[PDB]
PDB file of C-alpha atoms in Angstrom:
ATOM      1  CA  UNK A 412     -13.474  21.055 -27.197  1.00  0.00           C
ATOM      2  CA  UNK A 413     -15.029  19.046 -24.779  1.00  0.00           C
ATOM      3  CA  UNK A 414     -18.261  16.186 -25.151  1.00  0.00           C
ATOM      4  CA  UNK A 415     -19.515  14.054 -23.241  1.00  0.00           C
ATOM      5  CA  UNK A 416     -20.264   9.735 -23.756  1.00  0.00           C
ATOM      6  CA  UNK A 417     -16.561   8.930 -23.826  1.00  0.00           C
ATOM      7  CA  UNK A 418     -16.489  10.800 -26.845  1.00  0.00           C
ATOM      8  CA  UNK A 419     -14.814  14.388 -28.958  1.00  0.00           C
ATOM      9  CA  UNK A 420     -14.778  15.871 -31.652  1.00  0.00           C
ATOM     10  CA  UNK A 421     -11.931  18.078 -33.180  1.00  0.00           C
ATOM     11  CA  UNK A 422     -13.548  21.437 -34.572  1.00  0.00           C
ATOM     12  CA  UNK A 423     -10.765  22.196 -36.863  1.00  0.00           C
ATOM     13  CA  UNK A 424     -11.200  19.255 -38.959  1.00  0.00           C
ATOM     14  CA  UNK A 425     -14.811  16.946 -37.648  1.00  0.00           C
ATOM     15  CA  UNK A 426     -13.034  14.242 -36.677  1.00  0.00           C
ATOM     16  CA  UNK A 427     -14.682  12.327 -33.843  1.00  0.00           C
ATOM     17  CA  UNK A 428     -12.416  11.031 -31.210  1.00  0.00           C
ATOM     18  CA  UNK A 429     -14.234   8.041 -29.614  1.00  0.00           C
ATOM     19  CA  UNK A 430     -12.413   5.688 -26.413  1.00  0.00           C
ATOM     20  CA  UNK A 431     -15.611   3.596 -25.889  1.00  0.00           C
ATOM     21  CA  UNK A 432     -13.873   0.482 -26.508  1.00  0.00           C
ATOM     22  CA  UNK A 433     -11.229   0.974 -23.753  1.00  0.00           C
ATOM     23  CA  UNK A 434     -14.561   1.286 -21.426  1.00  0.00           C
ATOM     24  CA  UNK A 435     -15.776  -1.158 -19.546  1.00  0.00           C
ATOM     25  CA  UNK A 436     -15.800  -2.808 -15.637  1.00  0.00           C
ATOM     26  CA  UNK A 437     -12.739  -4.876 -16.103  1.00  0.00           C
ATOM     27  CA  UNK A 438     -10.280  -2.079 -16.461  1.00  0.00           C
ATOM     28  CA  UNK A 439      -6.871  -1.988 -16.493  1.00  0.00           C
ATOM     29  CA  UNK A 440      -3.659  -1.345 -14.148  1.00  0.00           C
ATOM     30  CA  UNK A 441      -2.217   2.002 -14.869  1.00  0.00           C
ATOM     31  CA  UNK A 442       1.748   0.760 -13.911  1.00  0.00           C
ATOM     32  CA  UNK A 443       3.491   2.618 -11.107  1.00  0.00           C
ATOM     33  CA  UNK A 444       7.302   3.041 -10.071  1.00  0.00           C
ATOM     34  CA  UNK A 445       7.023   3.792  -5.944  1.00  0.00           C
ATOM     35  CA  UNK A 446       4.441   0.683  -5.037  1.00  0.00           C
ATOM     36  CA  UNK A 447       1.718  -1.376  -6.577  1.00  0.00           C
ATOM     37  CA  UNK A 448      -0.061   0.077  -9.344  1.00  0.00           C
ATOM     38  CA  UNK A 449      -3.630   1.588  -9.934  1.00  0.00           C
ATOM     39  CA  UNK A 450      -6.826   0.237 -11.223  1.00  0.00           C
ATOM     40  CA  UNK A 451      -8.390   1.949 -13.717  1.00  0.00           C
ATOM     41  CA  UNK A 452     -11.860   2.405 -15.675  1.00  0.00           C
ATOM     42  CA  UNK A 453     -12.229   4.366 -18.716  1.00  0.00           C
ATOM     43  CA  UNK A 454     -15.248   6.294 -19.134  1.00  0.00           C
ATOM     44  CA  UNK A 455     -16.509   4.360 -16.061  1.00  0.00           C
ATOM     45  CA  UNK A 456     -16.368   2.899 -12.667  1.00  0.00           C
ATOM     46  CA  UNK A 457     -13.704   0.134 -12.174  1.00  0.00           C
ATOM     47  CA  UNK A 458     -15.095  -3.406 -11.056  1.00  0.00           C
ATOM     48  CA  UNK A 459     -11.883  -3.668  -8.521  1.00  0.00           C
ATOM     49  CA  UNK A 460     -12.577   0.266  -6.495  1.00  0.00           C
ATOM     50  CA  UNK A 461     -15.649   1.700  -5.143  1.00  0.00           C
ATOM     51  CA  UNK A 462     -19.061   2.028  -6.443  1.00  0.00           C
ATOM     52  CA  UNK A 463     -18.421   5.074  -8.822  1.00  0.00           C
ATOM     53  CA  UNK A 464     -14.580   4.873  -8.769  1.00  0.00           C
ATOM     54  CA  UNK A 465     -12.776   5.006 -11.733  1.00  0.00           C
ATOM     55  CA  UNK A 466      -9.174   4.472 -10.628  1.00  0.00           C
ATOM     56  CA  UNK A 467      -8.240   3.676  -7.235  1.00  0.00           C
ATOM     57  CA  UNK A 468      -4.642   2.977  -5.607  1.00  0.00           C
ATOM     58  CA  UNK A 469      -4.522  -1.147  -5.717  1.00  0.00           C
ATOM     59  CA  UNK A 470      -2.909  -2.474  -2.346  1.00  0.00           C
ATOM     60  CA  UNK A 471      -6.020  -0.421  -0.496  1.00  0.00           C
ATOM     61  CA  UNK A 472      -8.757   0.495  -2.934  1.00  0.00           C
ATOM     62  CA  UNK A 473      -8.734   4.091  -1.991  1.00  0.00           C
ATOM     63  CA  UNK A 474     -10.351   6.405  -4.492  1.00  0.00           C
ATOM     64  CA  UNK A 475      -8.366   8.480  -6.620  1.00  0.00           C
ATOM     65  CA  UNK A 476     -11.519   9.867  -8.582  1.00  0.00           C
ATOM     66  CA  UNK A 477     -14.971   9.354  -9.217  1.00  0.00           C
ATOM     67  CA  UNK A 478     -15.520   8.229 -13.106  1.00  0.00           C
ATOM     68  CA  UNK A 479     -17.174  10.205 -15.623  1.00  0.00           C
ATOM     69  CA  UNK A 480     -17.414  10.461 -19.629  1.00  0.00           C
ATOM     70  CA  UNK A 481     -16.491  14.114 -19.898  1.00  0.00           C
ATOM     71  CA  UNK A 482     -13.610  13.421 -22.520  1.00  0.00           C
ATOM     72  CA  UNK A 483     -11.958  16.649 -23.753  1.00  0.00           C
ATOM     73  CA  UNK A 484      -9.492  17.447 -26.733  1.00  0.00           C
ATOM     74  CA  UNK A 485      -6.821  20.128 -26.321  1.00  0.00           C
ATOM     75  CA  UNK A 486      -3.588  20.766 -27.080  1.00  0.00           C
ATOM     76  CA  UNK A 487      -3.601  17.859 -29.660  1.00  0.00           C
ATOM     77  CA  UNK A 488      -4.621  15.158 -26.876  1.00  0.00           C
ATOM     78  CA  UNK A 489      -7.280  13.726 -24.746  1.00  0.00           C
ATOM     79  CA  UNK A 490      -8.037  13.703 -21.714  1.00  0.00           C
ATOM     80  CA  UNK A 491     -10.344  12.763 -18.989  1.00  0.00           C
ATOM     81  CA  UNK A 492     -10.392  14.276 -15.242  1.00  0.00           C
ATOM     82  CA  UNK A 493     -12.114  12.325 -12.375  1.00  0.00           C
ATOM     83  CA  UNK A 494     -12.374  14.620  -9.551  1.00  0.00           C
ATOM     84  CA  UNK A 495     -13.340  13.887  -5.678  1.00  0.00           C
ATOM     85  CA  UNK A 496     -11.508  10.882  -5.148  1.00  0.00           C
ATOM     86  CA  UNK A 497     -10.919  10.294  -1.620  1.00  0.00           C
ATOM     87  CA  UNK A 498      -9.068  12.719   1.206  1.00  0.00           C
ATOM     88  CA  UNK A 499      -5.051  13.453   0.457  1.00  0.00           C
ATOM     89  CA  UNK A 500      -2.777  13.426   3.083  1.00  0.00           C
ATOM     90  CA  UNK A 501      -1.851  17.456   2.494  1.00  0.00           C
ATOM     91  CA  UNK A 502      -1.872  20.793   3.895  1.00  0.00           C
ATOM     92  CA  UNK A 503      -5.728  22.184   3.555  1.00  0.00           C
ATOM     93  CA  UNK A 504      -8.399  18.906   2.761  1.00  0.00           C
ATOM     94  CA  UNK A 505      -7.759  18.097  -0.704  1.00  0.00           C
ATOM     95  CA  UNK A 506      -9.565  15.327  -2.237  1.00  0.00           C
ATOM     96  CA  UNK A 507      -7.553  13.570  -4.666  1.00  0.00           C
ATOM     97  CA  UNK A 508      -8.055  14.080  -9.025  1.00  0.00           C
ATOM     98  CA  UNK A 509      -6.652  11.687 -11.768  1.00  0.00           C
ATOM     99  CA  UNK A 510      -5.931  13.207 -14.650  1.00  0.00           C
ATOM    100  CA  UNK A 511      -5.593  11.066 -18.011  1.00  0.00           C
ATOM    101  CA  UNK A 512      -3.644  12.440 -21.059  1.00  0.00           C
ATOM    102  CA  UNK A 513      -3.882   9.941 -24.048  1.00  0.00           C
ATOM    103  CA  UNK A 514      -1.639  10.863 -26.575  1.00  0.00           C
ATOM    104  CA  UNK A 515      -1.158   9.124 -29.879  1.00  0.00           C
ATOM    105  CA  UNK A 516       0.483   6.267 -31.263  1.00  0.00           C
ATOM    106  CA  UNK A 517       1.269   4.752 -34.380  1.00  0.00           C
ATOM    107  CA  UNK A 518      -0.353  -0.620 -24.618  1.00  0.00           C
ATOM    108  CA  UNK A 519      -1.098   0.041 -20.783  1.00  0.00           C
ATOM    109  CA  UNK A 520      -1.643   3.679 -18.784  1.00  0.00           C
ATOM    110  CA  UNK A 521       1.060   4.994 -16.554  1.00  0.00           C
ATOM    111  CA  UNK A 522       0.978   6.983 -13.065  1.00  0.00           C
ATOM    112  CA  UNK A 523       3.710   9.194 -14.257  1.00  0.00           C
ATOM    113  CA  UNK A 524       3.498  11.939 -11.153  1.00  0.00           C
ATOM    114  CA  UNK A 525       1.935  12.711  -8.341  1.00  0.00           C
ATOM    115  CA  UNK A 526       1.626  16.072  -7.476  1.00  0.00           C
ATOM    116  CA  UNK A 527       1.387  16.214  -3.377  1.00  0.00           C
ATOM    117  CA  UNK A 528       0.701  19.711  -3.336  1.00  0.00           C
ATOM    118  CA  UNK A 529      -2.496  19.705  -4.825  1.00  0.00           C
ATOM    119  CA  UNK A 530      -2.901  15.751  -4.726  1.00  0.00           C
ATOM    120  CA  UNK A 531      -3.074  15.294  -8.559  1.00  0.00           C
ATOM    121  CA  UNK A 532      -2.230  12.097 -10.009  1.00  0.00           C
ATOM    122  CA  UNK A 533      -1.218  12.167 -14.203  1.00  0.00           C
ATOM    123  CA  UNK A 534      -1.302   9.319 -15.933  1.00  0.00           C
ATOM    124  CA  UNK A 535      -0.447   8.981 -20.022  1.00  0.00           C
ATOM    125  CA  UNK A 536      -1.681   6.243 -22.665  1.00  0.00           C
ATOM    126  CA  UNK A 537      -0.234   5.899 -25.955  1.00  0.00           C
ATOM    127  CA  UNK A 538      -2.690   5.073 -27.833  1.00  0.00           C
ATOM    128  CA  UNK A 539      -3.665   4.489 -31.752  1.00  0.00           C
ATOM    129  CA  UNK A 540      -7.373   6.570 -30.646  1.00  0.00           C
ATOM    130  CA  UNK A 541      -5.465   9.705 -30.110  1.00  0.00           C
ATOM    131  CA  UNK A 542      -4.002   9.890 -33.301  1.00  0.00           C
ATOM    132  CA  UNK A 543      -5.552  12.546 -36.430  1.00  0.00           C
TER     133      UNK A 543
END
């Protein structure tokens, strides 16, 4: 499935999946092992990148994707993809994409990997809201 206003619902079962109260302009820092972290906006541009940015690298604000509320639900988690961030430094002009898997828990996002082949960033969130 996929819905938009930061919000899903499972099909099997009705169960609405909501992550409107991790939105907001504050953010958070998604933490990061080479280098300073990213800022990040859930369902939302973040206060700290620009206009229309929902996560950006923090030492130089560059956009790693332009926020939207298109949350899906597959594979038992959510996730959110903001596409055209700014230009990678690859092969062909790619434009970077974050990709945010939040999987359950029974609390702060990570950059896990960056793919610099295609100039994909995944991040992960534990997170009671993903949880059925």
């Amino acid at each position: 499935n996929e819905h938009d206003d930061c919000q899903v619902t499972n099909p099997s079962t009705g169960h609405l999946f909501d992550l409107s109260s991790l939105s907001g302009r504050a953010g958070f820092t998604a933490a990061y092992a080479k280098g300073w972290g990213v800022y990040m906006s859930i369902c939302g541009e973040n206060e700290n990148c620009p206009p229309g940015v929902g996560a950006c690298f923090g030492r130089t604000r560059i956009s790693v994707g332009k926020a939207n509320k298109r949350l899906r639900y597959v594979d038992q988690v959510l996730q959110l993809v903001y596409k055209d961030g700014s230009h990678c430094p690859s092969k062909h002009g790619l434009s970077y994409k974050s990709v945010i898997s939040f999987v359950c828990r029974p609390n702060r996002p990570m950059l896990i990997s960056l793919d610099k082949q295609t100039c994909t960033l995944f991040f992960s969130w534990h997170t009671p809201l993903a949880c059925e």
